[PDB]
Design a protein that fits this description.
Chain D: Keywords: Cytoplasm, Isopeptide bond, Nucleus, Phosphoprotein, Proteasome, Ubl conjugation. Chain D: One of its GO terms (cellular component) is nucleus. The structure is cut from a larger assembly and holds 10 protein chains of 8 kinds. By secondary structure, chain B is of the alpha+beta class. In chain B, 38% of the residues lie in helices and 11% in strands. Classes of the chains: A alpha+beta, B alpha+beta, C alpha+beta, D alpha+beta, E alpha+beta, F alpha+beta, G alpha+beta, H alpha+beta. The D-F interface holds D 7, 28, 30, 33-36, 38-39, 55-57, 60-61, 100 and F 85, 88-89, 92-93, 118, 120, 122-128, 137-138, 141. Strand 13 (212-218) of chain A pairs antiparallel with strand 12 (193-199) of chain D. Bound molecules: magnesium ion (MG) (4 copies). The site of one magnesium ion has 2 residues of chain J, from loops.
C-alpha cells in the first residue's frame, strides 16, 4: 500500500491506492483502503488487510455508541486514543498501520498510528510500502497554507508516486475530503490511470467445447 | 623432474634407444610360445652358467597375470617385473569395473601401450 | 563473506539532453555513528566518466585504486590515450561489472552499489548500475539505497521514458537532482548535508562541484507540532 | 506441513449477464497420495453458494458451522440470508479466530433475490473480504486460475457461454497443479434455477 | 551472511509456429518492491538465428547469455564457420548450465529458432540444464499464470469438438504469426494485471528464415 | 500400530488391521486387536501414536454406548462417523491433540447398505469404497483401483483383501505380523479366525 | 516420477510416465524419461531431471567409446557400473537419481540393473522407481507371472504406470512403452493418460472410485 | 534519540531532538519527545515510541487522579509512578525516560529512569542513543545554578553535538522551560545549531 | 543391509546374511547376497551405508586377489583381517569415511582352524566364536552365550544359526527376507541353498 | 581502549590509556598502546592486542626493509602498509589503528584505519571503545595549529573524559610527541588527570 494525509486551509484530505497483494500476486485490483470511523472521521489503512478493516470497524462501532452516549459528535483524538491503546495491547500482532483524519467541534486533525501503538502528528503524512515514494513528493511540494484543491492535487500526486514506483501499490487513487462546516466527501476512484487496454482476441468458446459427464437440476427452494 | 628426451629420431629415421632395447631382448634367454588346438604352451630357456641355484625361490620365467592369462619374456629381468606388476593391477581393475576378466588381446594391448609410452616420454628409457 | 563497516549511502543520477548528472553526499558512516565527513564518493575517470559508489568504503578505496591503475595501464604503448583510444565510460563499466560478478562468484564480494555515469565518444549518454551481486541495469534515472526509493520517483517525474531525455535541459536536471538530495537529507538517517555533484556534458565536458550544501529547507512548521495526539501545550 | 497445501483443491467463481457461476475440483489427497475423487468443495445455504479450499477438516467444519449459523438466521429473521450479508458473516467468523485461524480460502457466490444483482466475493484465511465484478479464485492453483481468468474472462457472458469460460479456466489451471483436479463440478446459477454439471477431465 | 543470489523478476514466453518462432519477455527489472529499470531487455539475438533468454537472477542470466554468445563465436572458429543448429545450441547450453551444478545459474532459460527442417523450435531449460523441445513455454515470475493459458490456446488442451460427446479432441494445428503475437500480447497484459514484477514494456523477437525481427509494446507501469 | 485397511463391497464392510505392536527394536506383541465395536453394526479400527489410539477408541466407544442406552437406539454409521470427526476436529487445536487415524465400517440397517468412512487425526472425513491409513495406501489404493468392483461378494472382498496383505508382506519394510479381519454386515460384526 | 522395468519369458518391458514437477507446479507433461543408449540398451530416469539427463547421455558416450575401443557392445553389467561408479564419486555432493539400465546381450541375456545416487547397484527381475513406485508395484506384483505374453506384458507395464499416474500427484502426463528382445529394443508408443484412463476404465471396468 | 534535562537557578529545562526512526528511514522529522504529564512536570522520551507514549499516557492519568484527590504531586512522586511502570514491566518495555518538574519548595528536579526501571535523581541527565557522544562534553561544561540563557546554550550546544554524530538523532531541537513564571516552549532549527 | 551373523565351530565358520534391500517404504530386492569371496578360504560379509558397502567389499576383494596373483599364495585369515582393519582405520579420518561393518570368516590352512573376525567401520577388530553387527547382536549374543559350545559340528552350527534367525524373525521390527548362509572350511566356501 | 592522535604547529602528538582487558578483568593496567614502526612514525593500537601487535611488527619489518633500500618512508607510505594488512585480512582481524608521523616536508600527519581497512587522513583522530564518549568534546575543542602545551592539554582532557566513562579504559595517560626536535615520551597519572 501507499496512503497519505494532507492538511489544508479549512480541513484535511486523505488518499490511498487500491492494490491488494498476496506475495507477488495482485489479489484485489480495486480494494477500498479508506475507512469510515464516523461520518466526518475517516481512516486510511496499510498493513494486514483484515486487521485494518477489523480494528477500524471495532473502534468505529465503539465511537458510534460513544457519540450516542455523550450526545456529541465524535472527536478524532478519541478514535486515535482507542485505536492506539487497542493496537498497543496486542504488541504489534495486529498489523494495522493507519492514517487517522477528520473534523470535529475542536477543529480539523491529522494523525498516524503504527501497529505497536505509536502515534504522531503532522500536516502531511504517508504510510505503507509506497510511503517513501509518496513522502518524497510530499517533501518536495508541500507548503503551509494549502487550499482544498491544492491539497487534493498534492495528496493524489503522492499516491501516484507510489502507484508508479512501488510494486506494492497500483491501480487507482481514492480520496476523502473532510472540510470544516461541510459533509465529508468520499471520492471513490477519484483517478483511474490504469485501465486495461482492449484485448487482442475474444476467447469465447464454441458451445460444446467442454466435455460433460453428468447434468442435474439443483434444488434451492424449501 | 628429470625431463631429457632419451628416445629421439636419428637422421635416418630410427629411434636408437628403442632399437638398442631390442638388443637387450636379443641377449635374453630364449622364450617360445606354441598354441595347439585346445591349449597354449610357453617354453623358456634357463642358462646353465648358474649352478648352486635355488629353483624353489628364484623368480620363475613365466608369470601369471590372472588365473587365465600368463606372461613370459626375453630381456632385462628387472624391467619385466615392472610390466608384470602393472599388468596384474590392470587385470584386477578390469574385473572391478567391467565385471569380467581381461581378454588376452586387451591385456596385451595394455602392456604394449605401457611399453610405447616409455618410448616418447621425457626422462625414461 | 563480509560485512560492511564504514559505509556510504545513496548515489543518485539521471540523463538529460546533452549528458548525465550524478551526485552523492560526503559521509562515511560507521553504523549509526556519522563518523567521517570529508569522504568523496564520486570518482572521475578521465574527462568523460564519473563513477559513483555506495556501500563499504574500504572496498570503494580499493575500486579507486583499480580505476587509477586502469588509466595508467591504458596509457601504456598507446599514442592515442588522450584521443581515440581514451577510456570510454562503457569500458570502465564492463570492467567493474566483470570484477563485481567474479567476486560474488568467489563468495567474497565488494560490498558496493555502483553507478557509472558518462558520455561516449559519439556523444551518447552512458548511465548504468552494478552492485555486489554483479546485477547490472540501465535506466534514464538510476539511484542506490534510499535514493532508489525516494530519488527515483522524483527524477522519473522529469524523465519518465527515453523520449523525455531530449526535452530535459541541464538546468532542469540539476534542479531535480539537488531537490532529491534535500529530500534524502530530510528522510535518510545516514545522510549528510554536504555533497558533491558532477555533470558530464557532450559539449562543456566534465564539471565537478564540491562542497555543495542542502538549502531552502522547510522546518518552520515544526513549531506548531506538539505532542503526539492530545497534548495542547 | 503447510496446512493450506496438504489436501489440495481449487474453487473459482465468475459473474455473467444476470447469472453467476462457481466451480471446484473433486480431489482430496494427503500430500502426494490421492485419497478421494468425490470431495466437493461447494456448499449452499438457501440460494447463497459457498466454496471452500484449503485444509479439508476446516472445509468440513466451516460448512457445518455456516449451515448452523444460517439455519438460526432464517429461524429468527424469517427469510433466507443474502450473499452480501452472508459474506459479512463469513468475515466475522474467520476474524474471530484471528490468532488461531481456519486454514481456508472461502468464496461466496449468488444472486441477491431482492435486487437481482449477481454477487461474488473471496476471503483470506483470516477474514479479509475481496469483492470483485468479474472473478474470484482460490486454492493451490490460484496463480494458474488468476492467469486463466484474467485472459479468458469477458463481461456480460450468457449462462451457456459463462459455463464454457469458467470450465476452461478451472480445467487448464487444475492440470498445471499436482494437488488439484481428479474431477470437477460447475454450478450455473440464474435468478430461480441452478444447474450443476460434472466435467470430464484428465485423472492424473 | 552474504547471499550470492537475488531475484530480478520479470517473465518470458516462447511459442513456435510452422516456419517461425517467437521469444517474448517483459522489459521490467526489479529488486524487492523497487523498479530498477522500465526498459532493460533480456531477450537477445545470439547469432545463427538463435534467440535466447535466461530469466531469474539477472547477473547469472547475463553471464550465461554472454558465455553462450561466446560459445557461438568459437563454434565458428573451430568448425569452419558452420551454422550452429538449434538442437546443438540446446545441448551446448545444457553443459554450460550443468557445469555449475553445485553452484547453479539461478535462471529459467528459453531459446527459440528454426530446426534443420526449417520448422519453428523452442527449447526450455531448468536452472541446472535439464532440457526439452516444446511448441510452447513460459518462464520466470509469471510462468504459473501464463503457461496454463498457453496449454489451452496453443495446444488446445481440454478443448473438445462440439457435439462429439467429449470424444473427439480439437485437432492440433500450427498458428500464424499474427495469431501467436495476439496470444503473447494477451498473455503479458493478463500477467501484468495480476503479477507485481511484470509490466512496463513487452519486447518480442520473431525468428524466420529471413532473420530476427523485433516488436515492442507498452505495458502497464504500476 | 501401522496397517489398517477397509473394503466396502455389495453387502458388507471388511476391516483388516495389523497384529504387531512394536516398540524400539522389539515386537512386544503379535496378536493385537486394533479395533473397537462402537455399536452392534459399527466397528472402528485405529492407528497412530502409542497410548492415544486405545484411549481415543475406548472414549468414542463409551460415548456411543452411552447414546445407545439413553435412546434405546443405534446411531447410523454416518451419524457415528460425524461424531468421531468432530471429536478429532476439536482435538487438533487442543493443547495436546489425539494423534489417531481411524476407519469406521458400519452397516446402516435403515438403508440396508454397507458404509466405510476414513477419518485422519486432523478430522478429515471421506466415505470410500476402500480405504487405508499410513503407508499402506501407497500400495493398496492402486491395487484396489484395478481389482475392485462395486458389486463384489463378501468372499470376493476377502480374496481382494488377501491380495492387499500379500502385496504389503512383499514390499513393506516392517514385519506387521499379519492381520485380524472383521466383517460388518446386516447380522452385525464377526471375526475371521483363519487369515 | 513413476518408472518400471520387469523381466519375463519374452524379454524386458520398460514403462515410464512423462511428468516433471517443481514443488506442486507441474512443469512438463511431455518429458522423455527413457534414454536410448544404443539399439540394445535403455536407461530410465527418476529424481533430478538434469542429473539423470546429463549423466545418462554421458553414459551413452562412454558406452560408444567402449565399443570403439573393444570392438564389441558393452555389457549391461559394465554399462550400469560405469554409471554407479560415477555417482559414487559424487556421493554426498547432492546428486539425485533413481535409474534402471535395461538391455540384452548374448553373454547376459535380458538384464536389468537398478542404479541410484547413493551408489546402490542391484541386478533384478522387477523394479519400480520414483515417487509413484509403490503404486506401480501394487498393480505389477499382483498381476506378474513369468509366462506373460508379449501382448499382456506390454499392457501390464502400461497399466502399472497408469495406476501410479492416477494416484501419485507427481506422476502423470503419458506412458512411454518399450520392449527389449534379443534383437534390441522396440518402441511401443506414447499413450496420453487423458485418453488412456477413460479407455482403460470403460474396457476393463476398473477405476470405480472415479465418477464415471 | 538524543534527550536531556538540566536544572538551573530558576528551575529546569528539558531538551530533545525531533527524529523518529525505523532502521535508517526517518518516519518523523518533527517529533515532539517532550511530553506533559502535569502542568509543570514533563518528561523526555527515548526508546520505543509506542512504549514511551503508552507509559506517559498512563502516568498522566495517574497524576490527574492524584491531583483530583491530593492536589499537585511532587516531581519525585511523578518519577515514582514512571518507575513503577518501567520496573514491573521491564521484560516488555524499551523505554528510557527522563522526568523533570518544578516545585516552589524543591525548585527544579531531574530524575532519570533507564531500561531496568531504576531511579536516579541528578543535577542533569542525558539519555538516548545520541547521549553517548556528549558524556565528555556535558561533564566538562555543566555547572550548577546556571542562568536561563546559559542553560539554553548548554542544551543547545550539547544536543547539537549529539545530533551531529548520532544518525538516529536530528531535525529540530525542542526545549521546554519550567520555572515559577510558567511553561515556555523553545525551538531551534538546523541553520542555527549546525554551525555552532 | 542390516543383519549379518557369524558362528565359528570346530571345523568351519558359518556366515548368515539378510537378503533384503530396502529403500524408503519399498523392499527393492529379497535375494541380495551381502558377501564377497576374498580368497578360496576367506569370505567377507558386510552391512552399512548404501553404496559404501559393495564399493568397499569389492575394493578389498580386488586387493586380496591382486596379492594372490602376485605371490601365488593365499593370505591367512588373520593377515586379511588386519589389512581390512587398517583400511577402515584409515577411512575413519578421511574426508568421507566408509560406513561399512564387516565380518570375516576364514579357514587357516596352515593352522587347520576356522577363524571369525568382527570389524566395525571405525576399524575395531576382534576375533570371536560368534559375531553380529547392528541390532542383531542384541538378540543373538545372549542366545549364543547360552547354546553355543566350542566343539560343535557344522550341522550343530547350522541348527544354532536357525535358532538365531527364528528369534530375529520373531522380535525384529523389519522384514529382512531371510538369510543366505555360507560355510567356510578346509574345502573352501559353499552356499546352503535351502534355509 | 581510548586512543587519539592530534596534529599541531610543530608536528603531531599521539595519546593512549594503559588498560588491557579480558572481560571486566584488567589483565594489564600499565600497557603501552603507542608503538614505534619507525623513528618518527608511530601508531596507536586498539582492538585485539594480539592482532595489533602482529600487524605493528610486520609493518615495522616492512618499513625497516623500505628504509634499507629507499631511505625514510613517508607517513602516508606507513599508513598504506597498515591498510594493506588490515584490508586484505579484514575477515580475520579486529584492529583499529591510528597512524601518526612527522616529515619535515609534510610536518605532522594523522591517518586512521578502522575495522574494514579503509584509510582516512584527518587533522586529528580518535578511536577505541572510549572514543565514543568524547566525539562531542573533541569536535568542540580541537583547533588547527595549536601549540605543544595546548595539544598536550587537549589530549589530556579528552582521554581523561574517555577514561572516566569507558570501563575498558584507564590507568595512565601515555603520550608521544613527534617534532623536528625529536621524540618525547610523556606520562600522566590518575591523581593529576582524574580531577581535571
Ligand atoms: Mg497423478
Ligand atoms: Mg507500482
Ligand atoms: Mg584473530
Ligand atoms: Mg575507567
Amino acid at each position: 500500500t501507499t496512503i497519505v494525509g494532507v492538511k489544508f486551509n479549512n480541513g484535511v484530505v486523505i488518499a490511498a491506492d487500491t492494490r491488494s497483494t498476496q506475495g507477488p500476486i495482485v489479489a484485489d485490483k480495486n480494494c477500498a483502503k479508506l475507512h469510515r470511523i464516523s461520518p466526518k472521521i475517516w481512516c486510511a489503512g496499510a498493513g494486514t488487510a483484515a486487521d485494518t478493516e477489523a480494528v477500524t470497524q471495532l473502534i468505529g462501532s465503539n465511537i458510534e455508541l460513544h457519540s450516542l452516549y455523550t450526545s456529541r459528535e465524535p472527536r478524532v483524538v478519541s478514535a486515535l486514543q482507542m485505536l492506539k491503546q487497542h493496537l498497543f495491547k496486542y504488541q504489534g500482532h495486529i498489523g494495522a498501520y493507519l492514517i487517522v483524519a477528520g473534523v470535529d467541534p475542536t477543529g480539523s486533525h491529522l494523525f498516524s498510528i503504527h501497529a505497536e501503538g505509536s502515534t504522531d502528528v503532522g500536516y502531511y503524512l504517508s504510510l505503507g510500502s509506497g510511503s517513501l515514494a509518496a513522502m518524497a513528493v510530499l517533501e518536495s511540494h508541500w507548503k503551509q497554507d494549502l487550499t482544498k484543491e491544492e491539497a487534493i492535487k498534492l495528496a493524489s500526486d503522492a499516491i501516484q508516486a507510489g502507484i508508479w514506483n512501488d510494486l506494492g501499490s497500483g491501480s487507482n487513487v481514492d480520496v476523502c475530503v473532510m472540510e470544516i462546516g461541510k459533509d465529508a466527501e468520499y471520492l471513490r476512484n477519484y483517478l483511474t490511470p490504469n485501465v486495461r487496454e482492449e484485448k487482442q482476441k475474444s476467447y469465447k468458446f464454441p458451445r460444446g467445447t467442454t466435455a460433460v459427464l453428468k447434468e442435474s437440476i439443483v434444488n434451492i427452494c424449501d | 623432474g628429470y625431463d631429457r628426451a632419451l628416445s629421439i629420431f636419428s637422421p635416418d629415421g630410427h629411434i636408437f634407444q628403442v632399437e638398442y632395447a631390442l638388443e637387450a631382448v636379443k641377449r635374453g634367454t630364449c622364450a617360445v610360445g606354441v598354441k595347439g588346438k585346445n591349449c597354449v604352451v610357453l617354453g623358456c630357456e634357463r642358462r646353465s652358467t648358474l649352478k648352486l641355484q635355488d629353483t624353489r625361490i628364484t623368480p620363475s620365467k613365466v608369470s601369471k597375470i590372472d588365473s587365465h592369462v600368463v606372461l613370459s619374456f626375453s630381456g632385462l629381468n628387472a624391467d619385466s617385473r615392472i610390466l608384470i606388476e602393472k599388468a596384474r593391477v590392470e587385470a584386477q581393475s578390469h574385473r572391478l569395473t567391467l565385471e569380467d576378466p581381461v581378454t588376452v588381446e586387451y591385456l596385451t594391448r595394455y602392456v604394449a601401450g605401457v611399453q610405447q609410452r616409455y618410448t616418447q616420454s621425457g626422462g625414461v628409457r | 563473506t563480509q560485512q560492511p563497516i564504514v559505509t556510504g549511502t545513496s548515489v543518485i543520477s539521471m540523463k538529460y539532453d546533452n549528458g548525465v548528472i550524478i551526485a552523492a553526499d560526503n559521509l562515511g558512516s560507521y553504523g549509526s555513528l556519522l563518523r567521517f565527513n570529508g569522504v568523496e564518493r564520486l570518482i572521475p575517470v578521465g574527462d568523460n566518466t564519473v563513477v559513483g559508489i555506495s556501500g563499504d568504503i574500504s572496498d570503494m578505496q580499493h575500486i579507486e585504486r583499480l580505476l587509477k591503475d586502469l588509466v595508467t595501464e591504458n596509457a601504456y604503448d598507446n599514442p592515442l590515450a588522450d584521443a581515440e583510444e581514451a577510456l570510454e565510460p562503457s569500458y570502465i563499466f564492463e570492467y567493474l561489472a566483470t570484477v563485481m560478478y567474479q567476486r560474488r562468484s568467489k563468495m567474497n564480494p565488494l560490498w558496493n552499489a555502483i553507478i557509472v555515469a558518462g558520455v561516449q565518444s559519439n556523444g551518447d549518454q552512458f548511465l548504468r548500475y552494478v552492485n555486489l551481486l554483479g546485477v547490472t541495469y540501465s535506466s534514464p534515472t538510476l539511484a542506490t539505497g534510499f535514493g532508489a526509493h525516494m530519488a527515483n520517483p522524483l527524477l522519473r517525474k522529469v524523465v519518465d521514458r527515453e523520449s523525455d531525455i531530449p526535452k530535459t535541459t541541464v538546468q532542469v536536471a540539476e534542479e531535480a537532482i539537488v531537490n532529491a538530495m534535500r529530500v534524502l537529507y530530510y528522510r535518510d538517517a545516514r545522510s549528510s548535508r554536504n555533497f558533491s555533484l558532477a555533470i558530464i556534458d557532450k559539449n562543456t565536458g566534465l564539471t565537478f562541484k564540491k562542497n555543495l550544501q542542502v538549502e531552502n529547507m522547510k522546518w518552520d512548521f515544526a513549531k506548531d507540532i506538539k505532542g503526539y495526539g492530545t497534548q495542547k501545550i | 506441513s503447510d496446512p493450506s497445501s496438504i489436501n489440495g483443491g481449487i474453487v473459482v467463481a465468475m459473474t455473467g449477464k444476470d447469472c453467476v457461476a462457481i466451480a471446484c475440483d473433486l480431489r482430496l489427497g494427503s500430500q502426494s497420495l490421492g485419497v478421494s475423487n468425490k470431495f466437493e468443495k461447494i456448499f449452499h445455504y438457501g440460494h447463497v453458494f459457498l466454496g471452500i479450499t484449503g485444509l479439508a477438516t476446516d472445509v468440513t467444519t466451516l460448512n457445518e458451522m455456516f449451515r448452523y449459523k444460517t439455519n438460526l438466521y432464517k429461524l429468527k429473521e424469517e427469510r433466507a440470508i443474502e450473499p452480501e450479508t452472508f459474506t459479512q458473516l463469513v468475515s466475522s467468523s474467520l476474524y474471530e479466530r484471528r490468532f488461531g485461524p481456519y486454514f481456508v480460502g472461502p468464496v461466496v457466490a449468488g444472486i441477491n433475490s431482492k435486487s437481482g444483482k449477481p454477487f461474488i466475493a473471496g476471503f483470506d484465511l483470516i477474514g479479509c473480504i475481496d469483492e470483485a465484478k468479474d472473478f474470484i479464485v482460490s486454492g493451490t492453483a490460484s496463480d494458474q486460475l488468476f492467469g486463466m481468468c484474467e485472459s479468458l474472462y469477458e463481461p456480460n457472458l450468457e449462462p451457456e457461454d459463462l459455463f464454457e469460460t469458467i470450465s476452461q479456466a478451472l480445467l487448464n489451471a487444475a492440470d498445471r497443479d499436482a494437488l488439484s483436479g481428479w474431477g470437477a463440478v460447475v454450478y450455473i446459477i440464474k435468478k430461480d434455477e441452478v444447474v450443476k454439471r460434472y466435467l470430464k477431465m484428465r485423472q492424473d | 551472511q552474504f547471499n550470492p543470489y537475488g531475484d530480478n523478476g520479470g517473465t518470458i514466453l516462447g511459442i513456435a509456429g510452422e516456419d517461425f518462432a517467437v521469444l517474448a519477455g517483459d522489459t521490467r527489472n526489479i529488486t524487492d518492491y523497487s523498479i530498477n529499470s522500465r526498459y532493460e531487455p533480456k531477450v537477445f539475438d545470439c547469432g545463427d538465428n538463435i534467440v535466447m533468454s535466461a530469466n531469474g537472477f539477472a547477473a547469472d542470466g547475463d553471464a550465461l547469455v554472454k558465455r553462450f554468445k561466446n560459445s557461438v563465436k568459437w563454434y565458428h572458429f573451430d568448425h569452419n564457420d558452420k551454422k550452429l543448429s538449434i538442437n546443438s545450441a540446446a545441448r551446448n547450453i545444457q553443459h554450460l548450465l550443468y557445469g555449475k551444478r553445485f553452484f547453479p545459474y539461478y535462471v529459467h532459460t528459453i531459446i527459440a529458432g528454426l530446426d534443420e527442417d526449417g520448422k519453428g523450435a523452442v527449447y526450455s531449460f531448468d536452472p541446472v540444464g535439464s532440457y526439452e523441445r516444446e511448441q510452447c513455454r513460459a518462464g520466470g515470475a509469471a510462468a504459473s499464470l501464463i503457461m496454463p493459458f498457453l496449454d489451452n490456446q496453443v495446444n488446445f488442451k481440454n478443448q473438445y469438438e462440439p457435439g462429439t460427446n467429449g470424444k473427439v479432441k480439437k485437432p492440433l494445428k500450427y498458428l500464424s504469426v499474427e495469431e501467436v503475437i495476439k496470444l503473447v500480447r494477451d498473455s503479458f497484459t493478463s500477467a501484468t494485471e495480476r503479477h507485481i514484477q511484470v509490466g512496463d514494456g513487452l519486447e518480442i523477437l520473431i525468428v524466420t528464415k529471413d532473420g530476427v525481427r523485433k516488436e515492442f509494446y507498452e505495458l502497464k507501469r504500476d | 500400530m501401522d496397517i489398517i485397511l477397509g473394503i466396502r463391497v455389495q453387502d458388507s464392510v471388511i476391516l483388516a488391521s495389523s497384529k504387531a505392536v512394536t516398540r524400539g527394536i522389539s515386537v512386544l506383541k503379535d496378536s493385537d486387536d486394533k479395533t473397537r465395536q462402537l455399536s452392534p453394526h459399527t466397528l472402528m479400527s485405529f492407528a497412530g501414536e502409542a497410548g492415544d489410539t486405545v484411549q481415543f477408541a475406548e472414549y468414542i466407544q463409551a460415548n456411543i454406548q452411552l447414546y445407545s442406552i439413553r435412546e434405546d437406539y443405534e446411531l447410523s454409521p454416518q451419524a457415528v462417523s460425524s461424531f468421531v470427526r468432530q471429536e478429532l476436529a476439536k482435538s487438533i487445536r487442543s493443547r495436546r491433540p489425539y494423534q489417531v487415524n481411524v476407519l469406521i465400517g458400519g452397516y446402516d440397517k435403515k438403508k440396508n447398505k454397507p458404509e466405510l468412512y476414513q477419518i485422519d487425526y486432523l478430522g478429515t472425513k471421506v466415505e470410500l469404497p476402500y480405504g487405508a491409513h499410513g503407508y499402506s495406501g501407497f500400495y493398496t489404493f492402486s491395487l484396489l483401483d484395478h481389482h475392485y468392483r462395486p458389486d463384489m461378494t463378501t468372499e470376493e472382498g476377502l480374496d481382494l483383501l488377501k491380495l492387499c496383505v500379500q502385496e504389503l508382506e512383499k514390499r513393506m519394510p516392517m514385519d506387521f505380523k499379519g492381520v485380524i479381519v472383521k466383517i460388518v454386515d446386516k447380522d452385525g460384526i464377526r471375526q475371521v479366525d483363519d487369515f | 516420477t513413476t518408472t518400471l522395468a520387469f523381466r519375463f519369458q519374452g524379454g524386458i518391458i520398460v514403462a515410464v510416465d512423462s511428468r516433471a514437477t517443481a514443488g506442486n507446479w507441474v512443469a512438463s507433461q511431455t518429458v522423455k524419461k527413457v534414454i536410448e543408449i544404443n539399439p540394445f540398451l535403455l536407461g530410465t530416469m527418476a529424481g533430478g531431471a538434469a542429473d539423470c539427463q546429463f549423466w545418462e547421455t554421458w553414459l551413452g558416450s562412454q558406452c560408444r567409446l567402449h565399443e570403439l575401443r573393444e570392438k564389441e557392445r558393452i555389457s549391461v553389467a559394465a554399462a550400469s557400473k560405469i554409471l554407479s561408479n560415477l555417482v559414487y564419486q559424487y556421493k554426498g555432493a547432492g546428486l539425485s537419481m533413481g535409474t534402471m539400465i535395461c538391455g540384452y546381450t548374448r553373454k547376459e541375456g535380458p538384464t536389468i540393473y537398478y542404479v541410484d545416487s547413493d551408489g546402490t547397484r542391484l541386478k533384478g527381475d522387477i523394479f519400480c522407481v520414483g515417487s509413484g513406485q509403490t503404486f506401480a508395484y501394487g498393480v505389477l506384483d499382483s498381476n506378474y507371472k513369468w509366462d506373460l505374453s508379449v501382448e499382456d506384458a506390454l499392457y501390464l507395464g502400461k497399466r502399472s504406470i497408469l495406476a501410479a499416474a492416477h494416484r501419485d500427484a507427481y506422476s502423470g502426463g503419458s506412458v512411454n512403452l518399450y520392449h527389449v528382445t534379443e534383437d534390441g529394443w522396440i518402441y511401443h508408443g506414447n499413450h496420453d493418460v487423458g485418453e488412456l484412463f477413460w479407455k482403460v476404465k470403460e474396457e476393463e471396468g476398473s477405476f470405480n472410485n472415479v465418477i464415471g | 534519540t538524543s534527550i536531556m534535562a538540566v536544572t538551573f537557578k530558576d528551575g529546569v529545562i528539558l531538551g530533545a531532538d525531533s527524529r523518529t526512526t525505523t532502521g535508517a528511514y526517518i518516519a518523523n522529522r518533527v517529533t515532539d519527545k517532550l511530553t506533559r504529564v502535569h502542568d509543570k512536570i514533563w518528561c523526555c522520551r527515548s526508546g520505543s515510541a509506542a512504549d514511551t507514549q503508552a507509559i506517559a499516557d498512563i502516568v498522566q492519568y495517574h497524576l490527574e487522579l492524584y491531583t483530583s484527590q491530593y492536589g499537585t504531586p511532587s516531581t519525585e512522586t511523578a518519577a515514582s509512578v514512571f518507575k513503577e511502570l518501567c520496573y514491573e514491566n521491564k521484560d516488555n518495555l524499551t523505554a528510557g525516560i527522563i522526568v523533570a518538574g518544578y516545585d516552589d519548595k524543591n525548585k527544579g528536579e531531574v530524575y532519570t529512569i533507564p531500561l531496568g526501571g531504576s531511579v536516579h535523581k541528578l543535577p542533569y541527565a542525558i539519555a538516548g542513543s545520541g547521549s553517548t557522544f556528549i558524556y565528555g562534553y556535558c561533564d566538562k561544561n555543566f555547572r550548577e545554578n546556571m542562568s536561563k540563557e546559559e542553560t539554553v546554550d548548554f542544551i543547545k550546544h550539547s544536543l547539537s553535538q549529539a545530533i551531529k554524530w548520532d544518525g538516529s538523532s536530528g531535525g529540530v531541537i525542542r526545549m521546554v522551560v519550567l520555572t515559577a513564571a510558567g511553561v515556555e516552549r523553545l525551538i531551534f532549527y538546523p541553520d542555527e545549531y549546525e554551525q555552532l
